[model samples]
Structures are given as C-alpha cells and as structure tokens.
Target: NAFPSTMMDEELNLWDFLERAAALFGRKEVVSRLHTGEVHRTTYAEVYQRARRLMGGLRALGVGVGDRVATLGFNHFRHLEAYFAVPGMGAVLHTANPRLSPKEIAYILNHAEDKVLLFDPNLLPLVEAIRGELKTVQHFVVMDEKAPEGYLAYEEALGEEADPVRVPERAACGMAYTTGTTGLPKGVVYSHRALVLHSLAASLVDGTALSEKDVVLPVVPMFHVNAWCLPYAATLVGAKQVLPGPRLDPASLVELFDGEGVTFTAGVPTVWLALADYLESTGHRLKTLRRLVVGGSAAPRSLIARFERMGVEVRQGYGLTETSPVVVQNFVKSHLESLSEEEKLTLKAKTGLPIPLVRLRVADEEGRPVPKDGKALGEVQLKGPWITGGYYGNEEATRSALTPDGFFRTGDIAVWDEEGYVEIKDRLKDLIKSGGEWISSVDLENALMGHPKVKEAAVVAIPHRPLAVVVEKPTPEELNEHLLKAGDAYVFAEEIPRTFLKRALREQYKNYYG
Candidate 1:
C-alpha cells in the first residue's frame, strides 16, 4: 500500500484531518462510556455534529479565536466534546485538573484567561466552590441538565445552534498546564497543527500503533496531555474509545477492560500496578488487551514480567507535558523477536527510541553530544513540531526551558545506547552529589521499590555536614532486614554515627538487624 503524499503535507492542520477522518469513517464508534451505573456510546458522526453545534454555541457566547474555554471535569463524552468543539470554533480548550485545590483551580482559570468554563454535573460543588473567585470565567457551561439553579446547561447551549461553523486555520486548539512540582503550574499552548500532527504520529504503527480494529480505553484523564493524545488518535482511525469517567479504581478498570473489549490502553505506572495486582490475584484475563502503554514513571520489571507471562505486551513509553507528552516508545522489531525474554525486558525498561520527526540528543555539561554507548550520561534535549516553542505568557520560564539553539532542554540526564535507544538516569533537580560524585535518586528509588516489602518509595537528596545523603522512608534498618533474609546485604553499624542515634532509632536498628 502506497502512502499518500497528500496526507504527508507539512502544512496540514487538525481540523482538516478531523473532517477527512469523519467523512471517511463517520459511522464508526468513537466513544464508549463504562461508568459504574451506566453504559453509553457515540459515533464519530454524532460527535462531529455535536462538536459543530458546540462551535456554534461558543460563537453565540462571544468566544472567538484564541479565547480560552476551560473544562473542569473527568474523562467523559462531554469532555471529549470540548476537546474538538472548543478548538473547532477557534478557541483554546483549557483542561483544568479537578484534583487541584479550589484556590489552585481559580488561579489556573484566571491565569489562562478562560472566557467560558465547561464542567461535568458531578463537579458542580467544586466549580461552585471556586466560582466566586474565578474572575476571568464569564460563562459556566454545565455538562448535564441539572445545572445547579442558575448555571448554563450544556444541552441548552448546543440546542441554541445548528449552524455549520468554519473554524480558522492555525488556531489554538488546546491548552495544558504543568504539574507545578517546582513552582506554580505554567501553561503550554497547543496549536491545531500540533494536535493534529501529534495525533497522526501517535496513531502510526510504531507510535501508539492504534488501528480501527483496536479498542482504546484511556485511563489517563482527558485533562492530561489530551489523555496522552489517545482519544484524538483513536478518532483518526475510528477506534472504539472507552472512557472510565472518574472511576479509576483497579476493580473498576478490570471490569471495564473486560466488558468494553479494550485492546489498547495507556496510563501512569501507579494505575497499571493496581490493575496488575488485581488481575494477578483474581486470575482475570484481558483476552482483548493486546498492549498496555506505561509512562509517567518507570514501570517495575516485575510488573512487566507478570504481564508478559499472561500473554499481554507492556510497552514502556517516555515523555513530558512539554513535548505534547509522547516522545519515545519501546516496541520490539522482527529481529528482536528471537532474543531471550530477559534481553527484551532490558530493552523495554529503557526510554526507547524516539518517534518519527522527533530529534533526540544527549549532551555533556558544555552541550557537546555524548557518545551513544549507553554509558556516558548527559542531559536530554528534544526538538519537534509538536514540542512547545515556549511557555505560555512566561518569557523567563520559556528561556530557561530551551537552549539558545531552540532545542527544549528536558532537564533529564540520560544515555543513548548503540542501537539509538535512550535510558533516563535522573532528573537534574533530583540528582544527588556525594563526595563530588553524582548519584541518581531515581536509581535509589527504583531499587527500594524493588524490595518485596516496600509498596512505594521516593529518594531525595538532603544536605549533610561533609556530603549529601539520600533520604527515603522505611529507615535503612527496616530495608536491610528485608534484604538480608533474601540473601541481600544488611545495614552496617559503622555506616551510622552511634553517638547521634536516638534510643528509639537504635532499638529499631537492633531489632531488625541484630
């Protein structure tokens, strides 16, 4: 099958692609709802029409090109409508995290200059709680009929318009804010072109590798990197999309995956870990599940091994919010099919190879490219069409994120293997310097999480008199006891200061290791 040159144009936009896709596959199922009490479904034809109505509604509400429409809700059909509707009418869809505090929610809405706020009915109290403080939000569009007395109902807004709206090219489609681990969360504006291209790239066989035959369940929230671009990508191929809709419990996920015929899904490691544990205990088999894309954190090898043993493939991916959230994926090729299971696991553990059209470079302290031997660690930098050029409205923050040459500095230390695969060593801020030698807190955390007794772990560097030391939970004594009985090293007494050890700490130490 020859690839169409017309589809490969560099100037193509999302609206055009969406229109073409809808025209080609209008009757295909686009969204499925598997909430606790109900099961719902919608096709691309209905979605496109409703989205058009939403465009008309936004136009009626005075939302124009570049204006922001913020949504505070979970993953639902209404949220999916805003994903295209807001942008289809030439406005930016700002997905406000419902998990954020009321004060933080107000701050994000105000900061993004959101003109209209769309929210799910279930989140009325949260919106109502913060409504008084949200100065920039002019209209509140509720997802359901019960709109808390005075709020505008989403159905009412869509009912007011049947006009076929033509959105402008090159308009801002969506906006996402950072997690703000270091400071107040900053926003990343995504253009129609970026979203469309990202969706295309993600849908490719080597990308998310989705197809019309695949059923996708994005457990990741729609507010997060556009649900890691899975929804849009699924639409491109007319795949069935099952949204968990605010219920992300392991039991719920297991049931949904089985009932919905979910073939492909993506989420952070924590969510999958819970699901994996439940499946292991229940001996439940996801017959339809072909692959699981794990990201946001390093997936444990044990988890990967368990899935593999069950005939399910776990593909590890890596990215940040700034790169439209997907930069690398680990997929085995024909040649690697004959490799041993352990060898394949090692490859899957790395960050994997860069996706098409995305450039990756590992640089030393002075910005020189490091060797691709998977040994010398260096800062990871990226450049791509989907990559953000700068932070929204913050010049200083943008400047700090990108190098003078325009590549976005990921602030992550990594090494590239001989086969061009990359493995992240640590985040620059999280690296520990002890006796002038750098140590990866991520490595320590991974090792700690590997212990049979430890459910979770985080290692942070703390200042000491002579050198920096890594601090983690479950004191060294507790960890050592779990290790030694398993034929691992025990904590040494000489490694600690006897004089400074408290009586309680000493007792814990002796009881564990004595």
Candidate 2:
C-alpha cells in the first residue's frame, strides 16, 4: 500500500514545501496583532515575497548560510517572516524570549553567536543595556521604522525588489532553542526535512486534529517550541493563523478568541486555567472553539472536566524541546465512543500515545525495559525523526541525556498500559519516596488544586531527621483551614505539617507531626 506523502522525494528542506504551499494557497489569511493597537495582515503569497526580500536584505548585509540571526520580539507577522527567511537562506533563526531577564537574553545571544539582532521598538531599552556585552552581534535592526533614536529601522533595511525566494534544501531550515527550566537552555537544531515531517504529523486527523477550515489561535509563545509547532502546521494546511502579540492576559485572550472566531488554540495548563476563570467570572463562552491542546505541564483532572462541562473539548499533548515539541497527543476516536464521560476524562488526563514514526519505552533503574502493566513506573525514553541528535555544543550533557542505545531519556517517570497509552507519573527529580514507596507530587498537587479556595499548590520534599517529608502549600489560606480541609490523616501526619503545610497543620491538628 502506498501512503500519501506531503512532499515529493526530491524536496529536502522546509522552504521548498512552504514555497509550494504559498503558490497553492496564496490567498489565505495570516494575521498578527500588536500591543500598540496595530494590526498586520498578509497572504501566503505576500509572506513568501517579503521573506525573499528579507533574505536579499540579509545577503546584502553579508549574512551567509549557517550564520545566526536572532530576534527579540513577541509573536508577530514580521517575526513569522524571519522564522522562514533566515533559515531558508541557510542561516539559523534564534528566537529570544522577551520574558527572560536581560542577563538570560544576553547569555543565549552570546551562546548562539547571533550576528544580527532584530528587535521591536518597545524592547529598545533591553537591547541597549545588553549591546555592550553582545560580542557576536554586529548589527541591530529594529522591527519598526519609527524606532526611537539610534536604531536601524526594519522598513528602511528591506529596500525594493520583491523577487521570488529560491527555497533551500531540507537540511538548511533552522528552529529556535528550548528553555530548560532546571538547567541552561539547550538548542534542538531541526533540519527542513524534520520540520516538514513534524508539521505534517501535526495536521493529521488523530494528531492535533487540524484542518484548513480551522481558525488557529496559538496562545503559546512563538519563542517556546515554535508555539508548540502550530504556526508551521497551520501554514502547512493553509489554516488562518491568529497571533496575539504580547498581551496574553485573560481578557485580551478572550476578546481575541471571540473576535477572530478561533476554532482551535494551544497553550500550557496555567494559561487555560486563567481563561477558564475569566469565562466563569464574566459568564463568557467560547461558541466557536471546538478544541484546545494543553501541554508544557500536566493539566489537572478538574481543569479538563471543567472545560468539557463548558462544551469545549480539551486534549492533552506531551513533548519537549528536544522532540521538536510534539511526540504524544490525545484525540478521541470512534472506538472509544462508548466510554463514559468520566472514563474519557481519565484518558485525557494521560499524555496519550506516540505519534507516527515515534517509539516510547519505560525503563527500570538498570536501564532495562519495564512491564507494560499500568502500575509499573520507569523513566520514559523516546526516539523519533524530529528528536534532536544531541545538544548543540555540550557533548558532556548530551552524552548523559541519551541512553546507551541512543534514545533520549526524557527525565520524566511514566507507565505504559497494555493498550499502548503512556501516562506520565512524575519528573524523576521531583518524585517523593516515603518508607521506600514512591509518591507522585504531581498527583498530590492535582488533588490540592481541586479544592475550593485553593489557587495553586506546589509539593516539594524536604529532609527530616527520620525520613524525607513532602511539603505542600495551599495558596492564600491560613494554616488551620488548609489542614482541616486536606482531610487525609496519613497525608497530615507524614506529608503535611512535617513536610508541607506548616502553619495550618500545626494549629488545627495537634501532635500530627510528632
């Protein structure tokens, strides 16, 4: 049987696929909004032409293949243009996170050896502060022409001649670095071939369930794993893209969703929680939203059920920066139609199964494969076409990151069921062991988040004279109310006062710690 391929065998890089897409879907809309109340709109044809102009302009400035071009702006149309232009010309596109501190920004720019730094006018102060320290940056181009004093204007730089861009081979397209919260951020270099395949996988019916009829609102930042790969996937399917510049607040997001007729969106659980709260408070509803993809962190069972009650179907996906940001996704099928709503909610809470061309395994402490019984927990390891070969420049960390057999050790502890579903249990570094039995901090945190009057909860293990104590704090509540409401005696004695809720556990329940 022959499977349909999105690209011909001769096409190697991402630009080739996008160039063809532009010609076929030139009239489709791609819109971006700015915090300054400005809007930028264009079609694929115009985007391709502008990208070519950017490529020509960079060429004149002496930028060549393999050189690094960095941008310091929120998600916008110009930024999307650079996403394709720089890499298509054989240079790397370094998307710097504006949320990071100035020091962190400087660290990444220096490490990437970015030669040209393009930024927005609003971030001029940040750029100026780090200008003296960026040894690799030779030029600074501001995105706005009316950029305040002493900056090269973006409009002035891309002078005339809107010619067709010659797409490079698949190996030449580049992607941004992934932010590792625990350690220094690492770059996961993606070839055009890998990215094109990843995007195609995302557009499948069982994947993100995306299509050209969908209006996509990517709430995820473009700097973060390419907005979880929605931007590229949307373009691949000719879906309308709605980018919400810098304002990700609940009010702003809801307005954007309603106004743009957003049918689908992607973001972490925290973002959805905020949106859900806003909707409940204001009695707002998402009439057009059909689906939502939540990742980056696990979504609480309550959060998933809440959205479902509101008539918006929420799915969970799992990946890291190393996996080109997508490896597992959850979408209900006809086979599971008979399952109860509660059972379906349970399934959605799991990370779901792996995508095509991706393989996953759970290994014990000795690096051996664990049984596929849902109860057995082990480190989750993965391998796929889009998975990074290794870190950019650090061989030592890279060596430790992979298994002897070359699969990437995901650092997450999970279990695989007989049905092939993968459910993440906890991060290996964050799991708590009590009396030789492992306890999932995430599970406990999820339970805590479900309690009324609790805004957030974090579980951390602290050293004790007898054994480790798992401490949890219920945000905004005094000590007594928290412990009284917790209602679990074992948790109160072993995990609450001695380990977690100090003020509440002590006064409400006497001698619980002792």
Candidate 3:
C-alpha cells in the first residue's frame, strides 16, 4: 500500500450539525404547535444552549457513552433537543412510536434496555399502561414544565451547559425499531457517520433540495424513521422547521401550512388525501406551499394530479425503516422538460431515481439483475452508507435481511425502466397471485383511485383475484369496467383497515372470492 498523505483526522458527529446551526443561523426560527393548543418558538442558539444543558442533565443522571435514551414524544423543540443531545453526548437516541400498543412499546424499551425515557404529556396514560412492563428503563421524564406524581419534568432535567463528547464515527448515535409486519419489532442502530451523510445527501439539489430559505414542515411523526431524516436534514441546512406536535388533522396541517408560510413539506399519502379533500371543500388555497412529498405508502395518480392542479408539486419518495428511510425520490431532470404532461405525471408517479451515493438494484431471487424492460418485477435491493448493516440483536433476521453478496433486501417488489426509475408494485408479502398469474396491487389501486368516485383504495388478495376495499361509492359496472380496461380484476368494499400486522388485510379478506 502506498503511504497516505497527512491530513487532519476529525470524527463526524451530530454536534457539528448543531454547532454550525447555532453559529451561522443562531437567530433562525424553530417553531412548534404544542399539544396544549399553543405555538412555541425558539431559535437555533437557544436550542444549542438547551441541548448542552440536556447533555449535562443526562450525564448527571448516569447516562454515559453507548447508553440508550429513548424519547416517546412528538415533533417539538424538546424532542429536537434530545435528537442532538443524546447522540452528541455519545449515547443513542431511540424515538419510540407512541401509536404502538403498550405491549409493543414496553417490549422495545425492554429489548433496547433503555435507561431513561422522555415522553410527551399527552401520552401519560400510555406510559402508565406500560410502565410496569418496562424492565430496563429507570428514569421517567415528562416533556413539560411540571411533572406528574412520580416523574421528572423536562425543564428540571437540565442542570448546566456542557460540551459534546467525541465518539467514533461508526458508533451508534440513533436507533429505531421496525413496525414488524412479520414478527416482533427489531432495532436498527444508526451511526453519526450514517446520519450525517444522510442529511447531506437528502439536501442535494437533485434530492429533497432543502435550503436555508425553505421553511420546512415535516408532518411525518418524529418517531417514524427520524421523520424520514428531515429533522437532521433541516437542521443541517439551518432551515426554519415547524413541528406539528400531536396534531395531524388536515385542518390543523392546513392552518400550519398557510399560517406558517411553509415552503416545503412531506408526509404519508393518507394525510395529503385528507388535505386535498379539505382544500376542495373549504375552497382555501395554500399561500406559500410549493412542494409536497408523499411516502410511507404509494400515492394514487389522482392525488398527485390534484396537488399539481393546486400548484403544489408532488414528489414521491420510496424507502424503508432499515434503509435510513430515503433512497429514491422523484424529480424531473432538466433534459425531460420536453415530455408531455401525461408523460411527466407518469414519470413522477414512478418511484423515481435513487438519490446520490446510493446503489440500487432490481434483482431476481438468485441475486441476479433483472432486465430494465419496465415489465419484469423483482425485489429492490440497496447498498449505501446510511443503510443499516443488520438488525441490532437478532443475527438470524440480520442474516436474512441481506443478499449473499451483501445488498440489503428491501422486501419491496418493483419494476424498473431503462431510465432507471423504479415503480414499486407491492411488498413481497402483499403481492397477489391469481391462477398462476401475478398482479400488482399498487398499479390496480392507483388505477382505481384515478376514478372520480373512489376516494381511497387498498387491494388485497381474495384467495386469488384482486379485491379492493375502498372509501367512497362507485357503481359495480363503473368499477368493473375500469379494472377490465386494464386487463386486471377487482372486488370493491366500502372500507378497509389501514394498519399493518403480518399483512392483516389479506388475511382478513381470506376466502372472500372462494
């Protein structure tokens, strides 16, 4: 090996993001709509000072390097402080989903062996439900000015300002557990290097393109894969961040979007669909909203069209809890400007290209590449800096999560075009096989939702053929013609469950067509 050139060696840490934000954008606003019907605002400088104090408090509470500190809170300034302080102090930040059942919450806290839990005041009942079951947590801090009977208050946890401790780049900085559609939730540990790189790549011009000028609002809960890494990305860019704490209703979101002058935002398709309906019914126009990103589940073609008509460009992003949550994003390349409106929409509706520094492959079961014919389906595999190496403690699951040659198996079935865009057809477990022929539920659902009468759609295998459980009314003939026109099949229902548990919908509709 050749001799290496001399250069400064500095470990990448979350503290750098905070330090830069405080130094450069100290006076910039960080806003949050509190759970108590109040808006709270602070600046980067204040966040920096408070984060340092939080570190001091955690240290005084016996938190040290490599310990796990969990937060069961919403998107707010205090939670944001934990985002940096825990990792910056050389511990791990685990943002647990409060929407999960008490048993699940307890299981993850126990599995991670978390030492402390900082939670939102609104979730006190939930905490009481699982507090006895938690085996490892020692301290309970409520994220409020006043703590209840046996808990410590958030403001009281801070003792004095302190500096961040330096840890190795590969050391764990953050951790999140998967929603576990197939089994128990497994943890994925994120490194400072992974998150730092993710923030940079996510802010690329071809990516989310977050900038200092953009007032970013992430309606995605902070518990879900770090809200798809937007908190870190926005912090890295020093953008104004508006956190909607515990309120995700369309009216609440619209109030924030219009009143806060949000220039960019993102969330699941369901939220956007509700907002679309609200916008149409109330005849209210968003004043400063420019771009809307829909992910988590696929967005119907009509939803994209509605937003486009309202002058808000909808970009579809695709990722998983294990892939640092964003690898593919939709954007029009400059060369594609001449494409027709329909063609443009079709391209945008696809999963779009992989972001910078990520390697993606649509591969067969044998780990071989499939043709880019846009017709053949395969699993979407990935390799990137931010992709988790494996599950935190389960070697068996970790071994199965990757291909033999080392690509993280995403479990998402998709077709790729020659232009390198991927359109996810279905999850591997969610695919429908009908009499030896396969069907794409994503395509069928998007097609059905394109109809004026179908508001929402979830297609599941009904012992064989595709069965659609949808909101809103449509005549049988009207729906059948739409499905028949695409050489597919469908059965309609008035409603469907949106939650996932071992593909419950498919199991729920079992034997319906039989």
Candidate 4:
C-alpha cells in the first residue's frame, strides 16, 4: 500500500506513535515484574523519556539508521523501551530469542550483524558464554541499572534527548528469528510501515479489538513475532500494560492477573494451562478478564469450554512469525451468539476469519481453490503488506518461499468452509508444536542417535503431549534413561490458527506444525 507520490500526505513514522501514547495516555499504568519476585509500576510519560534516553544512549554508542541494536531480555519495562528506542532512533531492534542454545544465539547475532547488545542481568552468563563467537557486536549494555565489571551500563549510556531520525516507513525497524526450523534460524525483519499498519489492523473490532479502556497483558514473549504486536497496538490505543518478568509460574501469573486488574491477555495455551490449574485449585477468579486468546497451536474445545465455564471468553487467532503473527482471528460473529454452548464453543475453536488488510487463499498446487465443504484440505497462502516477502540475507530461501504471483506460501494445510472460516489441519514444514513451545525433533533425534540402541530415530508431533521418538527396537529403558532428567514437560497467534480436540480442545492450532 505504498502509494508512489500519490500522497501529498505525510510519511508514517514510528516515533509519532510513542508521542501519541505519552501525549494522550501519560497517566496510563505499565506494570512490570522484576527478577526480584516483585512487580514494578511506571507510566507512559516516564517510559517515553526512558525510551528517548535509550535512543540517546544508542546514538552515543554510534548506532545510527541501518545499524542493528539487539536485545536479549524478558517481558519488562526495559524491553518495552527498546521496542520503541531502537526503531525510533531509526536503527533496527533485533529481539533475539534466549531459548535457543548459545551457539544458535551466536549464529543469529552474527547473521544480523547486530552492532550493540542490550541484555538483562541474569542473561550475563548467557552472553558471556557466547561472547567470543559474536563477530559484530561491538558493545554490551545490560538492560538493568548496573553493568557487570567490563560492560557498558544501559542507564549510564544515556547522554541527551535523541535527535529525530527520519526514514521512509519501509525502513527496517525491528528483527526477530523464527526457531523450530531446520538448520540456522531464519531472520524476519519488520518494517516500520508493515508494523504500524499491522497494529491498526490488529486493533480492529473484528481482530484483537483493543481500546484505551482495556488493560492488556502480553504473555507472548516480545522476543517473538513482535509479541504479536501487543506492545505497539496497546500503546497505540493507550491501553494499560502488564509485563510479567521471569516468574511464569501459574501461581505468580494468576496473582499478577488479579493484582493488575487485567482485562485482556494473549499467550500460547501452555501459559493458560498453569494459570487455569491454579484457578481450579485455588478457587480464585480473574474477575477483570474479559478475553483470553489462545494461539501458537490449536486449542482443545475443552480448554475453550473450560474457560467459558469459568466465565472467561476464549478467542482463537492464527499467524506466523512471517505474517506479523496475527492474520486470522476467530472472532465470533454476533449472529452466532444464539448458538448452543457446545456449538458456540465448537465454532469459536476454528481459526476464525482473516483480519482486515490481509488477502488469503487456500489453494492446491495449481493455485485453484479446494472444495469449501469444510473437509477438503489445501495449503494456506497469503499476501499482505505485513507478510514477509523473504528471509533476511537468505536469497535462496527468499526465492523458494514466494510464488511467481506474489503470494507468500504459508506452508500450512487447512480446511475452510464457504464462509471463509479456516481450520488448520497440518503443516507442510518440518517443525513441531507441543504445549505451546517447540523442541527440535532433529535435535532430539540427533542426540538419540548417539545412544547405542538408536540406529535410526525419527520424531513426530503428538498434539499437546511430549514428542514421540520412534527408533529401531526402541524401549522404555534406553529412552527413559537418556531423557528422564532432561525435562518432564512436552514442549510446545493471531489473525491466528484453530484448535481441534486431542483433539484435547485446549490446543490452538494456526501456527503449530507449519
């Protein structure tokens, strides 16, 4: 939608967004959890200043437009400031995923040529472990107040108010890597234009439907898919924000939910799992919660029903890291309100409909529509201003992903009824999703191969459960002995995906397998 000179209009700028938030919602509260096991509070007014100081700080370090400044931190105030600071300063903010191993971390940082790294206090060892492999990182600034002995202090890096950085809205504003894929992680750099427009589209009444009166808590990590644009959309609407720090335990999360009076929240189902367990055990309620969005994988009808029974509405959405993480939101239509509870829950579980401004097609190999009877399957393809056209610095992948007709192939198999509502059925890619997170089957199999009994090991996703590793003459003894201490959990969006029952009913499926 970039009109060439057709607009005698002003250019879109990300800085203007912060100005709007501070100017209009200066008093709005932003709550964040610190590593100290406590929540801290600030406001839009102070956050804007802190962000400006961050730009000043980045500038003092010689980070300019086109430079990449990276952040390896959790969901907190400092992370939010970086959301605006790096982009507002006209530099790309690369939000690195900390879940990846240190080696993967080094690969992506070097791949992006990130010039500066801002991190949390606890991740000091993580950075130190990979310090030697980071080829282009010239400075390390800890996000917290004091830097360790040999690093720059984030607070001390500030020098003055930032000078305005002007760029075409198409300029790269942010960067994130998609894990759970084969080989090196692929980078998706979001532009200022794509993100700002994505925010507007996401806030629509039919999408996330955010408003200033809403209190928003983004449980999705900001390091992933721009936290599905929650930080920006919430700011744009002047919605209150709750930033949960490291304590993701259901007990702490439920306590924060009540303490913050959160009206709306979004995260994968795994997040809702612990909180719901806490609620059932404690007999407490999030009286202020109006909507809980389940994404990252399909939700079980049971999870939706359980939440509905709890008097909280569960909405499903679908998107990918490449799709700004929210192109399909299963927003229920008003006419469907009269449906029976069971029917209503079932309908709400499909990845609803595409959000505005996105073009979607469920097509076969020849680019023709599959039957719309709701049972036929086809690959989901997309074209939108916000959808990624290519992976950063990976030309061969760029060539492979795009169609000659300009659509981005989602590589997801789905079924759609005549009404355009989609239900995801399978993924065309090699990744797997379980309980809202991912463990590389490739990684698991590679390790399994090291064991003497595992001549050939293969892994496939079992919905909402631990990965099923198939091997030649596999037995409980070798596997249990190998992976017993690894972790007990099965590992595991927007305009987002649908859920089928273990179809456990709790799994939300748009971005899961594909």
Per-residue lDDT of candidate 4, residues 1-514 (tens digit): 8756764766677777778999999999999998787778999999999888888888889899999999998899989988898889889999988777898899999999999999888899999999999999999998877888889988898768775686889999988887755456788888999889989998887778899999898888888778878999999999999999877888788878888889899888887887888888888888899888888777767778878889888888887455436888887788888998778887998887988899988887777778899866677888887899989988887788777787888877788988789887656544455555444444455455566766555444554333433433656566767865454222220111212122221233323433
For model 3, how does the per-residue alpha-carbon lDDT over 1-514 read when each residue is reduced to its tens digit? 9998798898888889889999999988899999986999999999999999999999999999999999998899999999999999999998899889888899899999999999999999999888999889889999999998889998999989998998999999989898755687889999999889888887788778899999999888888878878888898889999999988888899888888899999899888999999999998999999988888777877889999999998898887455437899888888887899999988888888999889999998898998899988889998998887689889888879888999998888999988888888888767877776677777777678778889877777777477777774777679878878877234555556555232667777677766
Backbone Cα, N, C clashes tallied per candidate: 0, 7, 0, 36
Judged by whole-model lDDT over C-alpha atoms, candidate 4 comes out at 0.79
Better of 3 and 4 by lDDT: 3
Best by TM-score: 3
Query: What's the ranking of the predictions by TM-score, best on top?
Result: 3, 1, 2, 4
lDDT of 3 at 153: 95
Query: CA lDDT of each candidate?
Result: 0.74, 0.75, 0.87, 0.79
Residue 153, candidate 3: Cα error in Å is 0.1
Per-residue lDDT, model 1, residue 415, is 85
Mind sharing the TM-score for model 1? 0.86
> Model 4, residue 85: what's the lDDT?
88
Model 4 TM-score?
Answer: 0.83
- What TM-score does each of the candidates earn? 0.86, 0.85, 0.92, 0.83
Ten contiguous residues minimizing lDDT sum, candidate 1:
464-473
**C-alpha lDDT (0 to 100) for residue 103 of candidate 1:** 84
Model 4, C-alpha of 419: deviation from truth (Å): 1.5
